[PDB]
Structures are given as C-alpha cells and as structure tokens.
Amino acid sequence: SPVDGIRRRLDDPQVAEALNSLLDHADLLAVLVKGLDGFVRRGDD
Amino acid sequence: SPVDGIRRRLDDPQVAEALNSLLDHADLLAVLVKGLDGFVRRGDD
Amino acid sequence: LDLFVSPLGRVEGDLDVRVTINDGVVTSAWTEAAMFRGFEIILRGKDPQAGLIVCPRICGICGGSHLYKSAYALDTAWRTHMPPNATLIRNICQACETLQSIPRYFYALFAIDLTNKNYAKSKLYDEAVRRFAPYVGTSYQPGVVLSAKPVEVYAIFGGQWPXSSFMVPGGVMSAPTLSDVTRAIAILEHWNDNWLEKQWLGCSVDRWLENKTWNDVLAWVDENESQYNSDCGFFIRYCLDVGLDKYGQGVGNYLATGTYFEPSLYENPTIEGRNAALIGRSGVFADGRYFEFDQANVTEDVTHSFYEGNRPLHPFEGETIPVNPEDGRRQGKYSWAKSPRYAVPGLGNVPLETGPLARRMAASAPDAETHQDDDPLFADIYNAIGPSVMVRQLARMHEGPKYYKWVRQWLDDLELKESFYTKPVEYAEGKGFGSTEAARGALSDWIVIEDSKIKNYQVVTPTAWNIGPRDASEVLGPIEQALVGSPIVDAEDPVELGHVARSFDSCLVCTVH
Amino acid sequence: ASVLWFQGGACSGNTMSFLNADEPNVVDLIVDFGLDLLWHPSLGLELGNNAQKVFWDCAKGERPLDIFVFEGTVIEAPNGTGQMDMFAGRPMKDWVTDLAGAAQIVVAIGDCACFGGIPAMEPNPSGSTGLQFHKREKGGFLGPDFRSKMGLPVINVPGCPAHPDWITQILVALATGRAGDITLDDLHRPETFFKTFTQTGCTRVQFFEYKQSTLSFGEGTRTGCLFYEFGCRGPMTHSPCNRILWNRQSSKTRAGMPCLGCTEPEFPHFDLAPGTVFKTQKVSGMIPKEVPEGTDHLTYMGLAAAARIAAPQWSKEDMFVV
Amino acid sequence: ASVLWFQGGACSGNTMSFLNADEPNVVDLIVDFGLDLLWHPSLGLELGNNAQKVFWDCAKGERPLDIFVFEGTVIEAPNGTGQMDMFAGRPMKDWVTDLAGAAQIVVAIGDCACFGGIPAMEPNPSGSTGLQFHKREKGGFLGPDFRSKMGLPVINVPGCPAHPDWITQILVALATGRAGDITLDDLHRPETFFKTFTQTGCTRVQFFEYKQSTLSFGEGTRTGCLFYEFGCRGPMTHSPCNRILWNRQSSKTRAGMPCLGCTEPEFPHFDLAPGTVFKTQKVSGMIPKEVPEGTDHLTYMGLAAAARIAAPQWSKEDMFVV
Ligand code: FCO
Ligand code: F3S
Ligand code: F3S
Ligand code: F3S
Ligand code: F3S
Ligand code: F3S
Ligand code: F3S
Ligand SMILES: [Mg+2]
Ligand code: 3NI
C-alpha cells in the first residue's frame, strides 16, 4: 500500500526527527501563514 | 513507534494550536501552491 | 543411435538438437530451444509503446524487423495514419536489415560448415575452404565485412543499428535529409556492386532476377565464368556436388506473413487491409496449394514447450507462463520454443516453414497486384527439385537482388518534403497485429492495449514457426522434419544437423524471446 | 590473446553491433590483432562436443583464457538453478562462474551482461542479472569483489547494444599493449567512452542550450532537442554515441530518437512503465522530473528560462532540413 | 552527366578532400553514378592538345557540359588579364567564362572558387575572386546575375577545403534525380549541409552552454569549448562539420582546433590579422566581439553569466579523457 509506505517513512528515525523539529517550530510556521493571511486580507489597504 | 512519537506530539496543546491555525489558512496555502502551479504551467507563456 | 548435439551454435542463440539416427540417417529429431528471457511476460503492464523498445531486443540480427512489426502492431491497434514516406522508410530499413542478414548469416553462420571435413573428397572442397573458412575465407571476409553496409542505411534513417526504436505509431521518428537519402543510395549501390553483384552473383542483380526456373538457375551458373565462380554459382555447384540438395526438405508447407507495404495502400494500417497492401506478398503454401494468410488462423501450442497450457492459443489470447524445465521434461516438454501452428482448411493446425523459401513460394502465388512480388522462380524450383538445404539457402540468397532493387526504388520514392510522421492518438484500448518478414520469415506481434497499458503482448517469430517443437498431435516442427532424413556421416561432428538448422537461418533468441 | 565469447540471456545484438565494427572490422580484429576467438555462439565453427571441449578446456585451465566476453544476462531462474539458460550441458551461470574465474579479463558486453538490462526488467522471469551489477547495484552474479586474473573487475561495455567500437577499441588496446591506458568508471565502464554524455556531440545541443523542444516525430525532428517532450536521457547518460557515431552514420538523438539512456545501469529506465516511453516526465507540466547530470532543478530551470528568453531565431526553426 | 573540373587559384585541397569521399567513394561516384568526368587536372588522363580538345569542345558546345566544377580562385591579375593563371593556352578566367556559360550547372568547390578565399586575402596579389562572390559580396567573377543553363546560380560548396560529402552528395543528388531536392541558401550553399552550424554536433557544445572555456591546446582541449579563448567560429559558421564528420573521424572542433569559419565567405576572417589567429577578440577582456549567430551581446552575456553560475561540475572537468 502507498499510504502504508508513508507510515513506514514516518517510522524512520531521521524522517521522524525532522518531522518532530517541524512540529517544534509549527508555531512559527502558523504565525508566518497567519501573517501572510493578514497581509492578504489587508492587501487592499 | 516514531509515528506514535508524533501522534503524542499531536497531543501537545501548543503544537495542536499551530497545526489548527495552519489548517485554518490551508485555503491560502492551497491557493498559493495552485498559483505557483499555474505560473509554472504558464512559464513558457 | 540417440545423438544429443549441444550446443548447435551459429543459430543466434541456444539450441540443442536431439536426433535418432538409424543407418546413418536421422529418423526423428527434437529441437530444444534452451534459453528463455520472457519478453512477453515483461511487456505486460508496460507502456503501450514499450514493445518498440523491448521487441528489437528479442534479437540483434532481426531487431529491426521486430521494431517494424511492433510499430505496425501499434499502428493497427491505434488506427494510426502512416505517411507514405514513413512506410517507405520502414520498408527500406526492414529490407536493409534483411540485406545485412543475408551475407552475414550466409558467410558467418552457414557457409563455414561447407568447409567440413565430410566434404574433403569433393573436387570443390579446396575452393570451398579457400572461400568460406571462418575468418580467413576469401569470400567470408568481404561478405561479413560488407554485411554491415545495409544497416548503415538503417542507421542513417534510424540513428543506429542494432537497437533503434525509431519506427513509431504514425510513422518514423526521423526526418531524412537529402544527404541522408543520397548517402543511403550510395551505400546501397556500393554494397550491391561490391558484395551482391561482384562477389555473390558475379553478374548484375537484373541478370540474376531473369532466372525464372531451376533450369534458368543452372544455365545461369554455366553461362560464364563470372557467374560460375561467383559465390552463388560456386554455392550451387557445391550443393549439387556434396548433396545439400538431397536433404533438409522439411514440411514442404510454408507461411509468409509478407512485409513491405505499398505506401499508398497502407496509409491507415488495419489488420484486414494488411495483405492487399503488401509488396512482399503474404501467403500460405500448404499441400501444394496457395492460401491467403490470416492471422486468425495462428495458434501456439505449448504441449512440448516449457510453458503451462492445455490448448493451442491464438496469440491475442496467448499466454507465456513458463514451467520449470525439469518438470516440463518430466511431462515430455523439451523446448522453450512454442509450437506455432496454422489452421489450413482440410489440413488442420499444421506446422508451416517460414523464411525466404516461404516468401518465394508466396511470391509465386497467382493474382499478384502490380505493387506485389510476382516471382515464379521458386514455384518452379519447388516443383523441379523440391525443398532442401540448397533450395532454402537459394531462396534466402535470391532475396538479395530482389530486396536490393526494392530498396533502391523506395529510396527513389522518398518525397523528402513530405511528412514522415502523423502524430497518432494513443488510445487507452486497442488490439494490434503487426507482421513483417524478418530475414528468417514471418514475424508477428499480437498486442492488446488496455487501460493505456500492455494487456497482452504475444510475439511469434519465424524461427518459432520453424524450430518450435512437436504440437499436441506430435507433428514435428518444420526444422524437426527437415532434420529427419538428414544423413549423418560423422556423429562426432554431425554437420548435416547444422546444415539443416542453419539453412533455416535459425535464430534461437527470436525463437524463445 | 584467446577470447571466449559466451551468450547468456542475450539477443545477440552486441555480437551484431560488434560485427558492424570498422577500424578495425571484426575480421581484422579476430585475425590481424592477435585475438584468438576460441568460440562464439554466433561465429564459432565447433558444435556439440567439440565446442564443449573448447569450453571445458577454458574452464578447467587446460588452455589459457585471456578474455572472457559475456553477452546477455546471467540467467538464474528457475529457483536459482539457471535452467532457463542451459548451454552446452550446464546452466549458463555455471559456465559463467567457471570461465570468469578462469579468464585474465572478463568483459560484459551490453547492459544485459553488465547490469541485467531488459531481461532484468520486472518481473524478471529469467532471474536475469549482470555479471557484476544488478542495475546500478554492484555485485550482480559474480559479486562486488570479483576480480579477473589480471586484477580487473568485469569490464562493463554497456549499451543495448554496445557500439562496436566500445568493445573493439578496448580489444585493440589490450592487443596493442595499451591495457594500462584503460581506465574504468564506477560502473566499470571504459572512461575513454563513458566520460562523455550521449548529449556530447548531439546535433541538438544548441536547441537544448536554448531550451527549444522538438515537438513531434518525423519532420518535427528537423529542429529542437528531444529532452523536453520525448524523454531524451542524453544529458543524463554517459556514452560517446554522438562522439563516435553509430554505424559510422548517426545516433539515436541525431536521427530524432530520444536517447533511452541505455548505457546507464537502470536501463530500461522506469522499466518502461506507462507514460515513460518517448515522454519527458514533468512536475507541474513544465519542470522535468530529471534534470541533466550535475544540475539541480532550481538552477536548471532558472537557466532554462534565461535561455528561452535569449534564444536566437534559428534555434526556433528547422535546421536538419532536406 | 559530363563533369569538367577545372582548377584556378587552387591548392587542390578540394580535389584531395573529394578524393577522400566515402559513400560514395570517388571512383564509384565517377564510374557507377553516371557522372562522366571529362577531365580534372589532378585525375584526367589527357594532356596538352588532347586535353585542350576536350576543353574547347566543352566551351564551344561541341559536346555537352552538364557540371562545370571550378576549384580555386578566378585569378584576374595582372591588370585584369588573368595571366597569373594561364591554363591550356588561355587565362584561366577565360576558360571560366566559356565553361560557366556552357555548363548546365556550375559548382564552385571550396572558398577560393566560391568567394575568393585565402588567395583573395589582402593584398590579393593574384587578383583572385570567386565565381559569383568576392567574399560576402555577391557577383564575384561571373556577376550576380549569372545563371547556368539549368537556371541555377553557381552552387557554392564552400569550405577550405570542402568536405567530400558536400560535393559528392550534391553530385549523387543530381545523378539520382534529386536535383530538385537541392535548396541553396543566400550564399548559394546547399542548405542540406549549411543550415546547421559547425557547432551543431560539436562535442564541446555542453561546455559552450555552460561557458566553460578550453584554456590551452593539447591536453587542455580534453575539456571546454574553444569559443572563448581560441576564437572558435563554430557558432557563427554554417557547416555540417560536426554533423558529417571529416574523414569519417572528427572535426576541427572535436579535435581541439577552433573552427576558422571556413565555410563562411569572409574566410579567412579578419584576414588573419595579428592577434586574430586562434584567439577570441574580446571587448574589455570579457565580452567576445562576435557572439553566436542570431544572438545579441546583452542577452548572450546575461545568459553566459547565468550559465556560468549554474554550471555543473562535470562541465568544469576533462571529458575527452584517455
Ligand atoms: N529474422 C528473424 Fe528473427 C527470427 N526468427 C525474427 O523475427
Ligand atoms: S543488445 Fe541484446 S544482448 Fe542484451 S544488452 Fe541489449 S538486449
Ligand atoms: S541535445 Fe541531444 S542528447 Fe537528447 S537532450 Fe537534446 S536530443
Ligand atoms: S539509448 Fe544508448 S546507444 Fe547511445 S543514444 Fe542513448 S546511450
Ligand atoms: S582547400 Fe585549397 S583550393 Fe582554395 S578553398 Fe581552400 S585554398
Ligand atoms: S561548442 Fe564547438 S563549434 Fe566551437 S564554439 Fe565551442 S568548440
Ligand atoms: S574551419 Fe571549416 S571545415 Fe568546418 S570546422 Fe570550421 S567550417
Ligand atoms: Mg511468443
Ligand atoms: Ni533473430
């Protein structure tokens, strides 16, 4: 199954480490996308 | 299991909050990637 | 005496021949194709055009033929349009590959056996050795060396030979330039002058093609010293002296699927319109009678082949499911060759010999259209002396002048400003039949495209026709019956088995694919 | 220098290509360069027991074996028995074992022998593998650590088939005392032929430089490079196909056929899966999935846009005109 | 088809190149393609009055003259008398007048005949000119409006010398009924050979694309393109030198020699003035004075900078390795 192969990659130490580090800074990603959303909804202004 | 390592990281209030805010603006992410896809398929033009 | 000859080389692949010998004569024969690659298995599920890449790799010497028929299989499956130039280029390249095969096979694969010690008593033996000894023969070296020229023409149009895939549904990939055509003409004329006419014939191609009867051929041999001492004249005299005209008769029934479409008649390839469009006519010659070739009559039997199966299968429903040769031999199977049979009315599913002789017999059929090969020579030879190693070889060699003339004319026919390719619709579904006459005979692809993938891909090669084992009725394949009756002077070097198998120009990589 | 040329899961295309040799031609190579061709299934005179006598003498060391050329795959099916390739009374793989162990030099000619090639395409019914490679993975049938008696690994002359010069010039080099001039790349290919790319000398590189695509076959190939629409692997394929022309005439790419990357161990690439034959797989319809060797998608695409902007008019017109 | 091949201010290089013809070779062209070579100074049997009889019969129309090939320049010095080229009792230019007026087709082979070539280099002591061109300027000796009896202008097969195929394939085309397939460019060169550039098929175009320069001759030419440091005119020169290889082997550029643009009417370019031989003239030491055909210095240089920055590693290493 392809989906099961992505779950297999998610069981790889290095992939897991990177995904964990992404989740650690997910707040920064969230804030940058929120900032972009804000900038977009104020693009007329 | 590293996939359950990140399932437990998905039980983190702050990580959950950021992931929820990302899913709130997923439409903007989708549209920017669609815009990039469009720009790429019109890159010859 | 049960004699197992392994390997019987110079058959482009892995062949073993088992023979029962009684009183110095083969009384029964088994041809054992010993090497399996399973390209039909590999092609399943691949891109619909994967055949254009894979099928040439069935065989080095006749891959261009594979390409030709695979391309036409796609053309029919996809109902493509073939611009006349594309048809011409395909014809030219198919014929050029055959023109390469003719001397390359004759000198490198066949004629060196003419130096066998069994012929040491022949008055022509010293000359045979001088001419045809491997690598040093005075006919061997120029024949083999010049055999590369026609495939230089092939490479001009296809990029390379072997292993181009430039024949695609809708035409050819290439766009010949003026210098391409002029160089192809120059190469062909040089090869014709230097090997075909100077060495093989000792006369012009036109003079050879004037031979309409066996008596014409004998008169041609005796006509002058040039023809007498030509490789062709010497070969005929050697065959008559050493008895190559006396065995290797075979089935006496022939299959030609034909090839070389008249460009105006096959612009929209279909299975049904194929026969009428052929220049090198199709035709089945069975029980002394001419029949129209119909691919629907083609079955493949695996009773004595190393494949699972219980009934002959038309290749559109063909299957290639190998069985382990140990188990298969326990079941009486002895060859990786399938047993192609042809349903001839009043005869059932019979073996048919394929090859140049089959083509010449087909060319002797009545009611040839203007574009079609109409040649009574081998009807006359068949009626006069019948098939044999010599007659089979002479058919092969006779194609040299004929195909050279056709290629020269096709090169003249190229309209360089016109299209070489009509972009086809790559239909997700389709059933294609592509056939050609490779150097060794009827080569055919039955392809079934489903869901934009190869659903089925069945190749039936000429040597599979010739060398394929006994069918369910235990009827020997053409090469097996040709081996039967062959004298065996020396069981330690049973060169006559080689003469018979190689007179078919057997290609075992093609046989099995 | 004795040469024993065996064919396993071969189509004999390497032999036929080899027979197209010029300078030297095959006869002059066999006779006049001191290369004693002991046997070749397509050319050897001996059959049956005489041929087997030659083979057994080579295998057991009764007579020297300087060069063992192997063409075709090492067929191991069924079940590792190799009986889908029975030759001269043995599975061909057993002959390969013995003769590769006996030879001074082992040359795998053609992808089948080098890497497994087309027969090794899935599902690989014949259990085919190369002599020292299975596709890119080193080891093949003989193992990664196999060395011939001259210390060399299997010399991989890839291609499907190999060009005659790729083998004949190596044989001449061996015969003329220039074996030491032969350097092999990481795939054991002669670097004298395989440092260049197929693209090297391609008549369409100027179109490539300016990102002008051939759009269609036939007359459409009077212009353009085949990389963008026909999956040309020229820039990702090491070969001298456009340096040393095929049949002394042409090359696939010159003729308008995309290079299928046949000198590369992955050939046939993508196993000819649907949509990969004579097509360039693209991301978002415009970025090729595979960019030329040594480039990255970012730089390659930036330079491609710049080149498209800078492209001169002639690069947009037919050039291989009648 | 009768052919009369005359040499004016020639070095016979076009004849020698022609004699290198393969497919067809020269003998097969002369014999087997129905081209009756009436005379050739390097090959004709007749001498003296017998040769002059042949020439006069061609000039006066006593016998048909289908193709008049002229090699070498039309020498007009001294003082327009042409006596620096006396042939068979006349100034060669007078023979040219008569025979060009008599021929069905006139073919100038080699730059000398096409455009004046090397002898027309200043100070042009021989008063050399081409048949229908003096360098790029149309008209040469015969005038811009000269047409042979088949209506064609002088067919210019340039080069110094012309490659044998450039003439032999034209002769084959004429002999095989494909004269109508022959299209001529603005310099009357066969477009089947002169739509491509020398660069077309050059083994160094990838280096050109990535602006990787050959830095030195000899082993330095194992890498790089010769355009930047050696004045390669490949990208400004129409020729099939890298498509149809010289001597079926190579080309200047492949071998490491810059294309001197010899198929171009200005050859030798810059009249070999000091500093222009095997050197790229540059502005401010970085910008080539001449950019490839159809390009502009600003887009070329911009693309060149982009290509340099995105250059792969292999483009910066030897590729034509031993
Ligand atoms: N010729 C040939 Fe090969 C065989 N048999 C095919 O088709
Ligand atoms: S030419 Fe044939 S032997 Fe293998 S390398 Fe290609 S399938
Ligand atoms: S330059 Fe040539 S090698 Fe292929 S990628 Fe373009 S056709
Ligand atoms: S497919 Fe192979 S023969 Fe050359 S042109 Fe490509 S490396
Ligand atoms: S080769 Fe000689 S004849 Fe003139 S064109 Fe060059 S100097
Ligand atoms: S690509 Fe070749 S033609 Fe000259 S400009 Fe460079 S060496
Ligand atoms: S100097 Fe002339 S011969 Fe060709 S490589 Fe340049 S156009
Ligand atoms: Mg089959
Ligand atoms: Ni074959």
Author numbering:
A (entry chain T), B (entry chain R): 20 to 64
C (entry chain A): 4 to 516
D (entry chain B), E (entry chain D): 2 to 323
Could you pull the original sentences from the published paper?
Out of the 188 amino acids of HucM, only residues 20–79 could be modelled into the cryo-EM density maps, with diffuse density corresponding to the remaining C-terminal region of HucM forming the stalk-like protrusion. To better resolve this region of the structure, we masked it and performed signal subtraction on the remainder of the Huc structure, followed by focused refinement and 3D classification. This processing showed that the C-terminal region of HucM forms a tube connecting the main body of the Huc oligomer to the membrane. AlphaFold modelling shows this tube consists of a symmetrical coiled-coil of α-helices composed of the four HucM molecules that encloses a chamber at the centre of Huc. These α-helices are amphipathic, with the hydrophobic face pointing inwards, lining the tube entirely with hydrophobic residues. Interaction of the tube with the phospholipid head groups of the membrane is facilitated by an outward-facing helix at the tube terminus containing arginine, lysine and tryptophan residues. By docking the model of the HucM tetramer into the map for the Huc stalk, we resolved the structure of the complete Huc complex. However, despite this strong evidence that Huc directly donates electrons from H2 oxidation to respiratory quinone, Huc is not an integral membrane protein, and thus the highly hydrophobic, membrane-bound menaquinone must be transported to its substrate-binding site 94 Å away from the membrane surface. The conduit for menaquinone entry to and exit from the hydrophobic chamber is probably provided by the membrane-associated Huc stalk. Through the scaffolding protein HucM, the Huc complex can extract menaquinone from the membrane and transport it 94 Å to the electron acceptor site of the enzyme.
